[PDB]
Amino acid sequence: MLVGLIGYGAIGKFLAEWLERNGFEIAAILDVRGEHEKMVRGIDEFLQREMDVAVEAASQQAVKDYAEKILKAGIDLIVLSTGAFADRDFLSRVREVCRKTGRRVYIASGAIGGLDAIFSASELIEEIVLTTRKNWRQFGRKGVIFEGSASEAAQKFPKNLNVAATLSIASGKDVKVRLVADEVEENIHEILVRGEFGEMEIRVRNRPMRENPKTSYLAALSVTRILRNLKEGLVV
Amino acid sequence: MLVGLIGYGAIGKFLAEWLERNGFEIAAILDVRGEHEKMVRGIDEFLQREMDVAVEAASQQAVKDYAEKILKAGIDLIVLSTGAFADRDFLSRVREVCRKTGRRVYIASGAIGGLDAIFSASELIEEIVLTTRKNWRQFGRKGVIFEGSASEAAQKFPKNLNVAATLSIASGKDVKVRLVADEVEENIHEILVRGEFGEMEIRVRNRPMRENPKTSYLAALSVTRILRNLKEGLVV
Ligand SMILES: NC(=O)c1ccc[n+]([C@@H]2O[C@H](COP(=O)([O-])OP(=O)(O)OC[C@H]3O[C@@H](n4cnc5c(N)ncnc54)[C@H](O)[C@@H]3O)[C@@H](O)[C@H]2O)c1
Ligand SMILES: NC(=O)c1ccc[n+]([C@@H]2O[C@H](COP(=O)([O-])OP(=O)(O)OC[C@H]3O[C@@H](n4cnc5c(N)ncnc54)[C@H](O)[C@@H]3O)[C@@H](O)[C@H]2O)c1
Structure with missing residues (x-):
C-alpha cells in the first residue's frame, strides 16, 4: 500500500x-x-x-x-x-x-477510545460531556482553563481540541467541554454519555509523545x- | 444502498x-x-x-x-x-x-466501546480485562459465575459473550474475563486496558432490547x- x-x-x-x-x-x-x-x-x-x-x-x-x-x-x-x-x-x-x-x-x-460506541448511539444521545486534564505549562496557568460548548472552545482554542471536534461530529451534539491545566505528566480525557441506549463512561490516561x-x-x-x-x- | x-x-x-x-x-x-x-x-x-x-x-x-x-x-x-x-x-x-x-x-x-483505541494500541497492550455483570436469572443464581480467559469463557458459554471475542480480536490478546450475575436489569460491561500507550477504562450500562x-x-x-x-x- x-x-x-x-x-x-x-x-x-x-x-x-x-x-x-x-x-x-x-x-x-x-x-x-x-x-x-x-x-x-x-x-x-x-x-x-x-x-x-x-x-x-x-x-x-x-x-x-x-x-x-x-x-x-x-x-x-x-x-x-x-x-x-x-x-x-x-x-x-x-x-x-x-x-x-x-x-x-x-x-x-x-487520543480517545469509544468513538465507535458514541457514533453507534448518536441518534439516542441526550447528554455528552468531555473533561480534559493536561500539563499546565503550555497554558502558563493551572486551574479551569475553559468550560463551555465544543463550538465555543474551538473559537478560543484554534489548532487544538480536536477530540472535542471529533466527539461533536460523532455524537451530532455540541459537546460540553471542560479543559483543566494541572501538574500532570499524562494527557487525560474523560467522556460521559447518556441516552436512550443507556450510559457509558470513557477514561483515557495518555502517555505524551516526546517530540x-x-x-x-x-x-x-x-x-x-x-x-x-x-x-x-x-x-x- | x-x-x-x-x-x-x-x-x-x-x-x-x-x-x-x-x-x-x-x-x-x-x-x-x-x-x-x-x-x-x-x-x-x-x-x-x-x-x-x-x-x-x-x-x-x-x-x-x-x-x-x-x-x-x-x-x-x-x-x-x-x-x-x-x-x-x-x-x-x-x-x-x-x-x-x-x-x-x-x-x-x-454492546461495548473502545475497540478503536484498543486495536490502535494493540501492539502496546500489557493488560486487558473485561468485567461483565448480567441479570442472574438465566444463570439460576447470583454471584461471580466465571473468571478466566476469553478463550475458556467461549468454551463454557457457547453462543454467548461475543464482547469477549471482539475484545480478543481487537487487542490480539486472550482477554481476562470475569462474569457476575446480579439483580441488575441490563448488561453492564467494564473494560480495563493498560500498556505503553497509557491506560483506558470503559464502562457501558446498556438497556436490554424488548424482543x-x-x-x-x-x-x-x-x-x-x-x-x-x-x-x-x-x-x-
Ligand atoms: N484527533 C486527535 O485525537 C489528535 C491528537 C493529537 C494531535 N492531533 C493533531 O495532529 C497534529 C499534531 O501533530 P504532532 O504532534 O505531529 O504536531 P507537530 O507540531 O509535532 O508536527 C506537525 C508538523 O506539521 C507541519 N505542518 C503544519 N502545517 C503544515 C502545512 N500546512 N503544510 C505542511 N506541513 C505542515 C509542521 O511543520 C510540523 O513539522 C496537530 O495538528 C493536532 O491538531 C490530533
Ligand atoms: N457483538 C455483540 O456485542 C452482540 C450483542 C448482542 C447479540 N449479539 C449476537 O447477535 C445475535 C443475537 O441477536 P438477537 O438479539 O437479534 O437474537 P434473536 O434470538 O432475537 O434473533 C436471532 C435470529 O437469528 C435467526 N438465526 C439464528 N441462526 C440462524 C441461521 N443459521 N440461519 C438463519 N437464521 C438464523 C433466529 O432464528 C432468530 O430469528 C446473537 O447471535 C448474538 O450472538 C452480539
Whole structure:
C-alpha cells in the first residue's frame, strides 16, 4: 500500500518508521521543515506521487488548505486535525466533494477510545460531556482553563481540541467541554454519555509523545488502526 | 444502498425498520423462522439477490455456515456473533478467503466501546480485562459465575459473550474475563486496558432490547454505524 504523509512532526516521524517497519511504502512526505528521502515542500509535489491514501498529521489549517485538492486528486484522506471541521461550512464543502468524487475522509479516533460506541448511539444521545486534564505549562496557568460548548472552545482554542471536534461530529451534539491545566505528566480525557441506549463512561490516561508533549501517543497509533483496516480482511 | 439481513430477531427486526427509515433498501432477509415480504429460508435464495453488504445478526453458527459463501459471492459481511471467531481455524480460513476475494468482514462494536483505541494500541497492550455483570436469572443464581480467559469463557458459554471475542480480536490478546450475575436489569460491561500507550477504562450500562432481553440495544445500533460509514464519504 502506498501512503502519503502530510506533517513530519512527532506523529509524522513515528508513522514514517511504522510504515517502513510494517511493509508499507511511503509515496511522499509533505512538510515545510525537516528532512527525509521522500520529503517535499509543497502540496503540488506531494500530489504528483500516486498513492492509495494520504494521512494528515500537521495542523487544522493544513486540512483546510489541502483536503479538497487531495480528494479531487483521487486520494482518500485520514484526518487527525479534526478541529478543522469545527467550521461547519468547510465540513459541508468537504462532504460535498466526497459525494461527487466518491472519495472518503477518515476521522482518526485520535487520543480517545469509544468513538465507535458514541457514533453507534448518536441518534439516542441526550447528554455528552468531555473533561480534559493536561500539563499546565503550555497554558502558563493551572486551574479551569475553559468550560463551555465544543463550538465555543474551538473559537478560543484554534489548532487544538480536536477530540472535542471529533466527539461533536460523532455524537451530532455540541459537546460540553471542560479543559483543566494541572501538574500532570499524562494527557487525560474523560467522556460521559447518556441516552436512550443507556450510559457509558470513557477514561483515557495518555502517555505524551516526546517530540510534542501536547500530543497523546495513542493519537499517532490511531492512524495505524485505519491503515491496517484498509489493508486487511477483518476490520475493527 | 442495498443491504441483506441474516437473522430476523430482536436486532434484525430493528435493523429492517431502521434501514427503510434511513434511505437504505432491504435486498433480502434470511431466517429459518419468521415472516417478512423479503424473507427467504436459505442462503442460496439470499445470495441471488443483489446487495452491497450483508448483516449477520443471527448466531455464531450462521457466521460459520454463511461467511465464506457470502464473501465468495462478492459481498462484504458485518458480523455481530463474533464469538464464532474464537474458532481459531475458522478465523484463519475466513482471513484466507478475505485475502483472495478482497472482501471485508466488519466486526461490529456491539454492546461495548473502545475497540478503536484498543486495536490502535494493540501492539502496546500489557493488560486487558473485561468485567461483565448480567441479570442472574438465566444463570439460576447470583454471584461471580466465571473468571478466566476469553478463550475458556467461549468454551463454557457457547453462543454467548461475543464482547469477549471482539475484545480478543481487537487487542490480539486472550482477554481476562470475569462474569457476575446480579439483580441488575441490563448488561453492564467494564473494560480495563493498560500498556505503553497509557491506560483506558470503559464502562457501558446498556438497556436490554424488548424482543430479546439478553441483547443490548447498543449492539443493534452498532450495526448502523458501519452501514452509515459505508454509505458516507466521512467515516467515523
Ligand atoms: N484527533 C486527535 O485525537 C489528535 C491528537 C493529537 C494531535 N492531533 C493533531 O495532529 C497534529 C499534531 O501533530 P504532532 O504532534 O505531529 O504536531 P507537530 O507540531 O509535532 O508536527 C506537525 C508538523 O506539521 C507541519 N505542518 C503544519 N502545517 C503544515 C502545512 N500546512 N503544510 C505542511 N506541513 C505542515 C509542521 O511543520 C510540523 O513539522 C496537530 O495538528 C493536532 O491538531 C490530533
Ligand atoms: N457483538 C455483540 O456485542 C452482540 C450483542 C448482542 C447479540 N449479539 C449476537 O447477535 C445475535 C443475537 O441477536 P438477537 O438479539 O437479534 O437474537 P434473536 O434470538 O432475537 O434473533 C436471532 C435470529 O437469528 C435467526 N438465526 C439464528 N441462526 C440462524 C441461521 N443459521 N440461519 C438463519 N437464521 C438464523 C433466529 O432464528 C432468530 O430469528 C446473537 O447471535 C448474538 O450472538 C452480539
